[PDB]
Scaffold this active site. Structure first.
Site, short mmCIF file in Angstrom:
data_model
loop_
_atom_site.label_atom_id
_atom_site.label_comp_id
_atom_site.label_asym_id
_atom_site.label_seq_id
_atom_site.Cartn_x
_atom_site.Cartn_y
_atom_site.Cartn_z
N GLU A 16 -39.06 92.93 49.20
CA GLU A 16 -40.43 93.22 48.79
C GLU A 16 -40.81 94.48 49.55
OE1 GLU A 16 -43.58 94.24 48.11
OE2 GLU A 16 -44.46 93.02 49.69
N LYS A 24 -37.49 86.91 61.76
CA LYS A 24 -37.79 88.02 62.65
C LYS A 24 -39.19 88.52 62.32
CE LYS A 24 -37.72 91.84 63.58
NZ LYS A 24 -38.91 92.55 64.13
N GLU A 36 -46.66 106.43 49.72
CA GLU A 36 -47.50 105.33 50.18
C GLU A 36 -48.13 105.69 51.54
OE1 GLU A 36 -45.52 101.53 51.55
OE2 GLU A 36 -46.95 100.67 50.13
N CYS A 80 -49.21 96.35 50.42
CA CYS A 80 -48.08 96.80 49.59
C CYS A 80 -48.52 97.26 48.19
CB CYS A 80 -47.02 95.69 49.49
SG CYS A 80 -47.63 94.05 48.85
N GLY A 110 -41.05 94.93 53.81
CA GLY A 110 -41.28 96.10 54.64
C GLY A 110 -41.20 97.35 53.80
N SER A 111 -40.73 98.44 54.40
CA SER A 111 -40.69 99.74 53.74
C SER A 111 -39.48 99.84 52.82
CB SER A 111 -40.67 100.88 54.76
OG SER A 111 -39.42 100.92 55.45
N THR A 112 -39.63 100.63 51.76
CA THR A 112 -38.51 100.96 50.89
C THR A 112 -37.32 101.52 51.70
OG1 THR A 112 -39.89 101.20 48.91
CG2 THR A 112 -37.79 102.37 48.92
N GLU A 113 -37.63 102.32 52.72
CA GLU A 113 -36.62 102.94 53.59
C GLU A 113 -35.69 101.94 54.30
OE1 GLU A 113 -37.84 105.42 57.09
OE2 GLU A 113 -35.86 104.64 57.70
N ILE A 114 -36.26 100.89 54.89
CA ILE A 114 -35.49 99.85 55.60
C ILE A 114 -34.88 98.81 54.64
CG2 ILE A 114 -35.54 98.01 57.42
CD1 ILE A 114 -35.90 100.86 58.54
N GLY A 115 -35.44 98.73 53.43
CA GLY A 115 -34.86 97.89 52.37
C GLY A 115 -33.43 98.34 52.09
N1 LIG Z 1 -33.12 98.67 60.85
C1 LIG Z 1 -33.76 97.49 60.63
N2 LIG Z 1 -33.06 96.40 60.24
C2 LIG Z 1 -33.68 95.24 60.02
N3 LIG Z 1 -35.00 95.11 60.18
C3 LIG Z 1 -35.75 96.17 60.57
C4 LIG Z 1 -35.14 97.40 60.81
N4 LIG Z 1 -36.11 98.27 61.18
C5 LIG Z 1 -37.29 97.60 61.18
N5 LIG Z 1 -37.06 96.32 60.81
C6 LIG Z 1 -38.05 95.22 60.66
O1 LIG Z 1 -38.47 95.09 59.29
C7 LIG Z 1 -39.84 94.66 59.23
C8 LIG Z 1 -40.61 95.61 58.30
O2 LIG Z 1 -40.95 96.83 58.97
P1 LIG Z 1 -40.52 98.35 58.57
O3 LIG Z 1 -39.82 98.33 57.23
O4 LIG Z 1 -39.83 98.96 59.76
O5 LIG Z 1 -41.96 99.08 58.34
P2 LIG Z 1 -42.58 100.34 59.15
O6 LIG Z 1 -41.42 101.11 59.76
O7 LIG Z 1 -43.32 101.14 58.10
O8 LIG Z 1 -43.49 99.70 60.17
C9 LIG Z 1 -40.35 94.61 60.68
O9 LIG Z 1 -40.39 93.25 61.16
C10 LIG Z 1 -39.33 95.41 61.47
O10 LIG Z 1 -39.15 94.93 62.81
#
Ligand SMILES: Nc1ncnc2c1ncn2[C@@H]1O[C@H](COP(=O)(O)OP(=O)(O)O)[C@@H](O)[C@H]1O
Ligand SMILES: Nc1ncnc2c1ncn2[C@@H]1O[C@H](COP(=O)(O)OP(=O)(O)O)[C@@H](O)[C@H]1O
Ligand code: NA
Ligand code: NA
Ligand code: NA
Ligand code: NA
Lengths: 494, 494, 494, 494
Positions: free
Chosen positions: A262, A186, A393, A296, A239-244
């Site tokens: 990561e 993705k 960050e 990062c 991606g972000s720590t939040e979505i991790g």
């Molecule tokens: N809820 C989610 N579940 C899985 N993947 C996600 C989700 N939200 C965003 N992503 C994807 O994860 C990747 C990293 O982005 P993300 O962590 O959202 O960084 P930011 O929000 O700071 O742009 C992107 O390819 C994004 O499409």
């Protein structure tokens, strides 16, 4: 030299890639991808959702079946395929560098000499691992022959971000394909284009259908579909720590797929008073401002010993003031636009908070152009550990300089973070370098340098900067499933 | 603290050790072993020759037969036996240190706290390797399962010197036995006793008869019988570079047995002008004078930067003059006698050459006692690269101090040697440390230390200082024979 | 499909290769190389001797100097260079396969599909190792940081035989160049031409001058000058056990250079009564007769269980009688000539010997053609262990069939040899496979197959078949010199 | 020989172990632990909850601080402490074996000869790894020295089940302590006693306070407090697949801590028609009935080729009928009670479902005693893939025998499971063994054997049987954090 770019490169790939073919989304929906230098739409891209991901996983599972062309293929031949793919990327280097810049914003000279170079190097490094990641024969007790097979983990979900679109694709595909896995990837909605063109090259290189599948689309739709899929064996997320957090919960709530992450950083860059001043100033600038601050492991906490603080800050201001922000296709441009409006607004929010919380604004601090998402190189002085800009960050061209007195103090302050991606130490002293590199709680510690990546050396976070490692031999561990075979023998001898 | 020594320990073992039994030599001849502190005979020792070696090898070969207790033993159990042997050596530590000192001359406190400690640490380290040196499973092209077995080399000839009798025994037995080999060991005529007592402990620990066999004797007789034997699979020799040549030719001229060699050195110890002076002087003293100067890697070329030369030299002369020479059972003694009269006279020969060739004699230079082989701590200054004492291994308490100006100069002069066993660098500067450790052509480079051995870290020569590595994981390679097994399978899959 | 060969390929390269340039011998001497299919001179080749070897070693030493292009080159880029060389060899594949056939005699279809294929696979495999052979960081006792560097061994002398000219060149160059060594290679006087052409491609690939130097000439002259050279750090030899001894002696007598040896064999191929008969007959034929019988690991003792003996012999004899001897450029040809007149005569001697000592001649036994050096495929039945044709390497199309009763018996008989290069077992039984593969004293044991080589799997002898291993990760060990760097640190922590 | 057990062994430890001291729960609450042979309370044990977990984590964290005794301790000394602990467990073997039986139910003979032996072997195995798990030196591009440090992951939450109380503790502590980690362990409420006594031995062994902490208590309280804790770096959980989910969610919902899981299974034991009948029957019985059926990798799906099905079942029934259930302290007893009343009731529940769904009850089926939780060895024949007893893990003495025709069929059926912990194959055929061990989707494949555990060989699940591996070198991976250090150097050379 660098070949002259096509500044308006033709887009050829904008659909879902499954089984070496191009597909519209099942919904027929598309989403726009924007050029961040102009704010204008480049083109429509198919908007993949759950149903498209389902198709992709099925294609991937089929490709992984025992006795399939990809499963029977010699490990050395997977190497050849990876080397062929790199040859094609290099063939189309000028085009990909230009497309990379068009969609992402980074200077073309950097896309060409840095991103594309690293991509080639990563794919060629991993091509070399394909037939070299041995299992073990094991001297177990009793009358047995015991050994391990290193098998592929299977269907790997790979969700990547927008900051190094081509490089992050290569970092994922290199170890996955070298170890014989199959991929559902993705790509980021902000930068899907280069990855999709590379899918055409995958097809051209001769990878069997279903080995690499790409689904462009949004995170909560396409990304979450992959992470919660019942038949994805493994997910890697950057991606972000939040979505991790979302990813690990999804994995646990679904099929207990293996997970690597990561995530973000707030990496400390520590300048001892005995540092080479000019070198330390230039490297600290690089460490922070590289890729529009969109890294990062950015050196976003610059700790400077008190005796050299004033001069360091003076020199750092001059360099930030002379950093060239402009059209990323101009050879003289050091800094392009931020990747999108949301990012643009968020960074400007952080500069505001910095000014408000009593950090000394030393240069920049505003919008740099009236079109596209350009921001002035910004330096904040006398930053304190409790400040929001010292903790969160920013992911923009916003430098934090903090003062310290002692080596013992700075270790405590540097380590006082939930992040632990990278750190660096600038010093001429052997014992200071060894003291600090051992004491710092970070995945990479650079000594008298910064952002030195090599396909050979692993990279990844301590603490909430993620888990598992990418690159090097280490980067194969997440893509391997270990099987023990223990066989009864008539009489075991040494 | 150190337990009080028995200054005349009883000798229980003075014969040839074969199949866990004691034998007279077939000729019934014996040779005296001398106490170097007094010149007096300690006892007679069976004088093993070719016939005795032939018996030893046949016993080792039988112990090695497929299906024997030693061949069938669990790898983990070889570890258990090694740990048991270490426990027995620990039990008998006071006795063994005092016997070591009686026969060799080294200070009892050093025998106890250094040699005995390092022996235990070495045996306990290799005990841990016994069941951990895995073969590989290999992704070969085509429809095959391919793997490697790490098998023992077989019957190992081990010829060892007199300078660290017990430690050299442990260095050889640890990796050999961890990997399932059998041993025919030839101990030095100067120091046969402690190794023979250890044989009693090997039997007590429970090693099958024939697994370790020990032939005390002379070099051209017992040693050469081993090196030229048609049924010895591997020889490890530690000694002079001159005999090293003899050994390698013997192997070539016989059955092409595998060879490793640990030979002499003329190791440079480099003191940059930014070094910690007090530390550097003390460590340079240790580097040279340790073990009566009878160390393969003695820091016998002390290169000192011109700006610190006079002070370093002054401090070094004071340190050498304070060094207590005397009875090795006296706790105040820092330096015992040389090992025998041949070494005694050779070292005085070297001192007279030193003086005659124009080196500056700054202290010592003579005989230190009227009984036993004691030599005063001797320091030469203004040594030049072309001088005999700068080129040839002295193997005694004779320090050479050489002046240099530049880092490039010292690199080349240090490297201009047919030896390359070790080197050391004293500096506070990161870049100087790294430049030097890379540039130096030596098996071990110490940084701000000297004579730091760990069972964990490999040790061995570049150039004519020998070949192969002892200690660490590396120490296992020379003791392993690799077998590939390649099996037709119905259908290879990843 | 195989491209039609040029049956009279032009010779472009016939001189000494030093510093990427072609040189006459100092003496101006040249030697004829002969086409074994016709007995006619192909062309003359420069006859290198000691003085030419001296120049080549000086050039290699120069290319190896610290700070040289070759030493400073990124390991990954050594990989790129090996990869580029493989590409150029593949570009010139049809030419090289024909030239191999012309000078060596092997069928062109085999040169093309086998030799050239295996060359490409070796080089590409080692390209991948170039940046992956890591040293170690080591948890030593005390306040130290200890690590190892894997450095090149340095100037490597490589002496190769005539049976697989291009392949043996690749087996040597692959691992030496991947690990950053430099090479002085002496090619066989019988087959110099293809290796010299490859030298042109080494220059075309971009290897710095002096990295590879090739000296054609004779053994007691050029080969012996390499083995005795005072500035050659390592020698690798493939050939007779007889000359292997000379090499190890020459090494010991000179500078104690590191030695590896790939020598003869008399490899047992064991057919159990439960084997697939059709398969085992076809594989036993291939095991012996491959490459005109000129293969180090030839299955030259075919042990057949008594219950299937008569049928196995009947079928083996029909198979040997059907083997097509003729012009190696004819696609119908299975067997070309022996390499030269010497080998021709040596084989005729062994055939007469078998007849004299009472082995049963079942077919062949004579000269197959008037011109060149063609010998009939010959099968001896009822061979006994004590017979000369059962003990000594023949290196021609001469098959020995021995009868046995029990698995325990055949182990003892197979292992009763001073050779131990290879072995094979044909059986359908799990336990018999595992019992035999364990018990056989052989560097490679094939199970239900023969002559299955993989770039990934090590190969080398037990006993007097040699020492050290080629291919796989193991191939890199002999080309690496290990340096421990042990650095004092303020305070060691885990 | 086996020492006579104390059938009512005394209890010395029943509190929370923190900082090498015993503590009541903060709440002062206790829970009964029950003897399953009688149904009677053995004693009260402190009921740990979040507050006690918090105290332990703070203890572990302090012991992990840079410069603490445990961080500074030589890796080799960590190994010595593990060996000392093993020595103490061996000294107290008779007592610990009886305590295990008392609390858990397993036959004393088994506790003593199997569990205790395996605990000792595990700990002594990992003692050997303490100073051998090297990081790497890496030949990265550019003028850099790049290396890895293998650091400890940190504070390790370890949650273990009740089926092998002492062994599971060892499996966890061995690798965690070998690599310098600190531990907070949550032992099963059903079996807290033995692990608490071992904590006394840990204090006695000399492990610094806070290195190992043990919190008895329940899962939703103490275990969940560990999984959700914000200063626990890594969690390792062994137990049900259901609770595995909860752990992974808790880790991603808290601090993104590192997770490994060892979960349930429904392992296929495949008996081919050519199998050794007597051996297969005995091994299939062991495979299912070991440890009262309370084994994660139990052979709970016994697939039998149709040609031998009738005979195999007939013999399996006779063998189960002859299995002795009773007092686990009596030497004749092969089967004790199940661990508790919940498990007791759950198993009778599965036996009922088996009868209801039409599986052929061949023997057993009910309770085996009026007191304690004893269940009759129960065998079901004609089991079908859709039945509950064929799909769900029973964890009791309930055997399922299924019929099959072809090798291809049985692969599909064996792999049609969301479990993948182990599998086994019984055959004489080489090709069938290799074909099956490759195709079976299981972490361990036993050939002609079952439940062969070795400290040297890794063990762990595919699919929902868990992730990561324990035992062998692989067991260290989850307990290591990898740091890259990359240092600017003056000029990189090979
Ligand atoms: N809820 C989610 N579940 C899985 N993947 C996600 C989700 N939200 C965003 N992503 C994807 O994860 C990747 C990293 O982005 P993300 O962590 O959202 O960084 P930011 O929000 O700071 O742009 C992107 O390819 C994004 O499409
Ligand atoms: N004395 C020698 N020293 C070094 N190399 C030699 C010597 N004699 C032969 N050689 C070389 O070694 C290689 C292998 O040859 P050799 O073992 O003699 O086989 P053969 O004599 O059967 O051709 C060839 O390149 C050959 O020229
Ligand atoms: Na975009
Ligand atoms: Na003596
Ligand atoms: Na020829
Ligand atoms: Na209980």
């Amino acid at each position: 030299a660098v070949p002259a770019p096509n500044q308006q490169p033709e887009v050829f790939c904008n659909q879902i890639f499954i089984n070496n073919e191009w597909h519209d989304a099942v919904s027929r929906k598309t989403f726009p991808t924007v050029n961040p230098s102009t704010g204008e739409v480049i083109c429509q891209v198919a908007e993949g959702d759950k149903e498209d991901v389902d198709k992709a996983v099925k294609a991937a599972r089929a490709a992984f079946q025992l006795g399939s062309p990809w499963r029977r293929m010699d490990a050395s031949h997977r190497g050849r395929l990876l080397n062929r793919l790199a040859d094609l990327i290099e063939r189309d280097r000028t085009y990909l560098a230009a497309l990379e810049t068009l969609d992402n914003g980074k200077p073309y000279v950097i896309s060409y000499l840095v991103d594309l170079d690293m991509v080639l190097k990563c794919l060629r490094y991993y091509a070399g691992w394909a037939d070299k990641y041995h299992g073990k024969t094991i001297p177990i007790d009793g009358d047995f022959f015991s050994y391990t097979r290193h098998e592929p983990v299977g269907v790997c979900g790979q969700i990547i971000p927008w900051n190094f679109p081509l490089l992050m694709q290569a970092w994922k595909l290199g170890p996955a394909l070298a170890t014989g896995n199959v991929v559902v990837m993705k790509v980021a909605e902000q930068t899907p284009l280069t990855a999709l063109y590379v899918a055409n090259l995958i097809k051209e290189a001769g990878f069997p259908p279903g080995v690499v599948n790409i689904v462009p689309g949004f995170g909560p739709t396409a990304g979450a579909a992959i992470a919660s899929h019942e038949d994805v064996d493994k997910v890697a997320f950057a991606g972000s720590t939040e979505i991790g957090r979302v990813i690990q919960v999804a994995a646990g709530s679904s099929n207990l797929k293996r997970v690597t992450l990561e995530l973000g950083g707030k990496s400390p860059n520590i300048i001892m008073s005995d540092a080479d001043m000019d070198w330390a100033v230039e490297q600290a600038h690089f460490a922070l401002f590289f890729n529009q601050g969109q890294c990062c492991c950015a050196g976003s906490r610059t700790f400077v010993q008190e005796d050299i603080y004033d001069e360091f800050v003076e020199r750092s201001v001059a360099r930030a003031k002379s950093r060239v922000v402009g059209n990323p296709f101009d050879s003289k441009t050091e800094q392009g636009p931020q990747v999108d409006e949301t990012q643009f607004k968020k960074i400007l929010g952080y500069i505001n908070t910095g000014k408000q919380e009593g950090a000394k604004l030393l240069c920049g601090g505003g919008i740099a152009a009236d079109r596209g998402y350009f921001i002035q190189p910004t330096v904040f002085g006398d930053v304190q550990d409790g400040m929001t800009i010292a903790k969160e960050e920013i992911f923009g061209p916003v430098m934090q300089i903090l003062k310290f007195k002692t080596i013992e103090e700075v270790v405590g302050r540097a380590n006082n973070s939930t992040y632990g991606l990278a750190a660096a130490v600038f010093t001429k002293d052997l014992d200071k370098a060894n003291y600090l590199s051992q004491a710092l709680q970070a995945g990479t510690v650079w000594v008298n340098c910064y952002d030195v990546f090599g396909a050979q050396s692993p990279f990844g976070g301590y603490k909430m900067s993620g888990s598992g490692r990418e690159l090097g031999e280490y980067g194969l561990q997440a893509y391997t499933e270990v099987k023990t075979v223990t066989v009864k023998v008539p009489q075991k001898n040494s």
